[PDB]
Amino acid sequence: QVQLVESGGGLVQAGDSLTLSCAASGRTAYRYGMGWFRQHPGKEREFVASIWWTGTTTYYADSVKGRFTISRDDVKNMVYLQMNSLKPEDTAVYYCAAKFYGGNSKRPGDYAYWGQGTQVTVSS
Amino acid sequence: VSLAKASLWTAASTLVKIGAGLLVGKLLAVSFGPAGLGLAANFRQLITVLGVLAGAGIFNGVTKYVAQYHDNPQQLRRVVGTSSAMVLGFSTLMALVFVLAAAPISQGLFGNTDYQGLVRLVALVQMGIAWGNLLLALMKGFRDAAGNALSLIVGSLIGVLAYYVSYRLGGYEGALLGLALIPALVVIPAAIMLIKRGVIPLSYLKPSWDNGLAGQLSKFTLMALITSVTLPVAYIMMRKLLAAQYSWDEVGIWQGVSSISDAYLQFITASFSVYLLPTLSRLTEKRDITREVVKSLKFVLPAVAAASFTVWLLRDFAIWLLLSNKFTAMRDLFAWQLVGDVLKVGAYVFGYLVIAKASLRFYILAEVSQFTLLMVFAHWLIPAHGALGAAQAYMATYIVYFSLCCGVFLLWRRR
Amino acid sequence: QVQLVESGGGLVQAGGSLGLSCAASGRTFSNYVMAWFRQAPGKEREFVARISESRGTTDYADSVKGRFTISRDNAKNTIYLQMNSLNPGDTAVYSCAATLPAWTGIIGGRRPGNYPYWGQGTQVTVS
After folding, report:
1. Do residue B210 and residue B275 come from a single domain?
2. Any chain B CB within 8 A of the CB of A54?
């Protein structure tokens, strides 16, 4: 059992950067693989980036790799999604999800716990 | 001599050898950083291989036949004489190959040919590794745990000082030469201890050739060739699969907890060649053989279980000093790995009985069974659990392998 | 980690002059020990010059001393090699190398294996 809250996100121009933070609150949260998901109105949540529960390997979506970078701090139990070169297409509500001994799946159904979600809007 | 007395003496030499390796290892990482560590990975592996290859891999046979023919002085002289000629002859061929192929060897170890002079220097250093390991194999044949421990301890002290003087003079290449001198300089305290304890006359080391004995010692050369090919290949294809569905850093935490076991298990397994191998080699009947095996299992099983539970209780502390604290999730693989260590140690009892009987039939069957069991379990657990599965497949391998060793032993005992 | 690019190569008659430059990438360039190496066509690497990370202490090979001069510019992360009295025996591919003081030791400053970061090398031909 882990609680996930999201930080950051808001109105930002097109081309600059904007990072996020997912604070993991739970007992032995290092055993949970973390993943980032975003959603558009009408469509379902799509995969963005995840990390293995050991924190050794990372995964990225096809339209995400090279631009976004996901990191995790085990000491403070917080996940990050450093976004670079933002396009208006990246405008979505971003969620961080956790799974016990997971973090290698791109499907939202393979993640047990979810956050409330933060809003990211890219204009210009 | 006994299993308890030999284990305490070997534990002192293991404690010093481990502590000396951590001091040289940390000094290596601090002096040259990650660039010098990755550039020296292949060279360091060759030094470990030379600990067995430079003497043609007859050391287990030397201990077996010295213990078998310790009573007859004329036969014992032929054993040491043939072993001395086999070690001197093969190491000389190794020196010639290392000199002529100094450029290709340096290319295969470092990627360039700037280390030719070091390889040629290693051609002489490996002779000290071969002769030093032979003298230690002679003490093991007489179950001289104290003489073998005193040689390794004193050798560890001069090896640390030699590495210090070498790296301060030669820089990075001096440190590489110093890493090679650490196992080679054991020949100096071992030679002194062989004559101070008076168990073997120095004239017995005169090279002679008994044709029937050289062929018998060649059986252990094939054994060392099989054990250095069968299982290490399984781990190569294991880490290949582990690094195909995950990253190489996931392999790093798998090999990281394995290095944990490789160190602390020596407090139990290193005494097998000092006592169990020479003792089982002298026993002839199945009743006496079963007595030793059961007595050894009643000792190493609770001892390795108390040590494994102690390692699990200090897994957070052991991750700190022994390895770089990079992934805190490295603590979750200890529970599965230490269980497999307990049963692999128990399986080593039956394995060393195969050495004492020079049985090539049971040796190949043991290596093939461990190979098939590892590949079957890794093909099922690695792609799903990652490095945890690599440690889970290793545990399940020796759960079934130890049960297969016990079952095969029961049919062999009752014939 | 450390990238090195040589420049200034060319063809120069016997007894002429030529100057090489080696640009290093990355900070803490002043803490690195830099050196020049050459490789004649069909032969192994040969030490030429080396500049120390402190005192500006230099070291030159026997067949080079009195003719070549190595210098260091920490503000530009650049190593220079002023080659005077160029003989036909100096025709080789000159490459620069970077290393740390612990890699060189006391007497191991002329050995190419003590340098992990190497440059590609520029061609210098005499006569």
Report:
1. no
2. yes
Per the structure, the complete domain to which residue A9 belongs is given by: 2-105+112-122
**Chain B within 8 Å of C42 (Cβ-Cβ)?**
no
Contact at CB, B171 and C44, closer than 8 angstroms: no
Separation CA C124–CA C127 (nearest Å): 10
Identify whether residues B190 and B59 lie together within a single domain.
yes
Contact B265, B304 (CB under 8 A): yes
Please report residues of C whose CB lies closer than 8 A to that of B117.
Answer: 111
Q: How far apart are CA B69 and CA C19, in angstroms?
A: 73
Torsion (CA) B304, B305, B307, B309 in degrees, nearest 10: 160
Residue/partner pairs of B192-199 with CB below 8 Å, 24 or more apart: B193/B139, B193/B147, B193/B150, B193/B151, B194/B135, B194/B138, B194/B139, B194/B147, B197/B139, B197/B144, B197/B147, B199/B139, B199/B142, B199/B144, B199/B147
Q: Is there a single domain that holds both residue B240 and residue B372?
A: yes
Nearest 10 degrees: Cα torsion B123, B161, B140, B289: -100
Same domain, B259 and B349: yes
Of the candidates C1, C102, C117, the beta carbon closest to that of B32 is on C102
Q: Cα separation of C121 and B38, whole Å?
A: 24
Length of chain C equals 127
* Number of structural domains found in chain A: 1
Helices (H), B58-144: 59-68, 73-100, 102-110, 116-141
In a domain, C126, yes or no: no
Please state, in angstroms and rounded to a whole number, the distance separating the CA atoms of residues B370 and B366. Answer: 6
CATH classification of the domain holding A33: 2.60.40.10
The answer to whether the CB atoms of C108 and B170 lie below 8 A apart is yes
Are A54 and B385 an interchain contact pair (Cβ–Cβ within 8 Å)?
A: no
Resolution (A): 2.5
- Domain ends where: B190, B215, B240? B215
Q: Are chains C and A in contact at 3+ CB pairs closer than 8 Å?
A: no
The distance of B274 to chain C (nearest Cα, Å) reads 40
Chain C CB contacts of B113 under 8 Å are: 44
CATH number at residue C110: 2.60.40.10
- Closest C-alpha to A33, from A11, A59, A54, A14: A54
Beta carbons of C113 and B173 less than 8 Å apart: yes
With 0-12 CB in 10 A as exposed, 13-18 as middle and 19+ as buried, what is B1?
middle
Q: Per the structure, how many domains does chain B have? A: 2
CB–CB of B349/B366 below 8 Å? Answer: no
Backbone angles phi and psi of A37, in degrees to 5: -130, 145
Could you give the number of structural domains in chain C? 1
Backbone angles phi, psi at C20, to 5 degrees: -105, 150
Q: Are residues B135 and B195 in the same domain?
A: yes
A101/B246 touch (CB, cutoff 8 Å), yes or no:
no
Experimental determination technique: X-ray
Query: In terms of domains, do B408 and B283 share one?
Result: yes
Chain C residues with beta carbon closer than 8 angstroms to that of B116: 44
Q: What is the extent of the structural domain holding B43?
A: 3-215
- Residues of chain B contacting C111 with CB distance shorter than 8 Å: 114, 117, 170-171, 173
Residues B157 and B66 occupy one common structural domain: yes
